[PDB]
């Protein structure tokens, strides 16, 4: 569950994913909320 800065561990894909990919989504992951804002 630990990644590089500005990524989250996606429990659906079991992989580290850029927070940037979830900024278009309605409710980003809790840990991404600071990056998208």
């Amino acid at each position: 569950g630990q990644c590089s800065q500005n990524e989250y561990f996606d429990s659906l894909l079991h992989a580290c994913i850029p927070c940037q990919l979830r900024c278009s989504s309605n409710t980003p992951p809790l840990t991404c909320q600071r990056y998208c804002n």
């Binding site: 659906l12 894909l13 979830r22 278009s24 989504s25 309605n26 992951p29 809790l30």
Partner: protein
């Protein structure tokens, strides 16, 4: 003579700071005992081998959507299967069903969960769009 359980949504739930969406299930077909829906999980009572299948219908632009089906018991979560779908970024076009299934050894006392690992996921409550079932083999 096989035990069966087919289930359809009544509503979704998503706790505030979690990044998960679950479905409250209602049984529409039932034969035999050994399985009991309650809220967003299914309890296993009869140990054995079961066909498990799950479909969710998504209307969501999040780059990927899908569901994780698991069993919990004896203080131990085990992921059984998951389904993953890439979604169109255009909200007018962004529709995909996600179906997966497998056959698993379920133990008495297991809790079966179906989790969409996004908060406030936009998924259909339609009984022919989103559903979950079991067949004891």
């Amino acid at each position: 003579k096989h035990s069966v359980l087919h289930l359809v949504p009544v509503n979704i739930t998503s706790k505030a700071d979690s990044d998960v969406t679950e479905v409250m299930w209602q049984p529409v077909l039932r034969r035999g005992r050994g399985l009991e829906a309650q809220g967003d999980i299914v309890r296993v009572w009869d140990t054995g081998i079961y066909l498990l299948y799950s479909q969710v219908l998504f209307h969501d632009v999040t780059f990927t959507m899908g569901q994780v089906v698991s069993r919990e018991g004896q203080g131990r979560r085990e992921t059984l299967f998951r389904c993953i779908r890439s979604m169109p970024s255009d909200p007018d076009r962004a529709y995909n069903s996600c179906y997966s299934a497998g056959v698993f050894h379920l133990h008495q006392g297991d809790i079966i969960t179906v989790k969409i690992p996004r908060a406030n996921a936009k998924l259909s409550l339609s009984p022919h769009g989103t559903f979950l079932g079991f067949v004891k083999l």
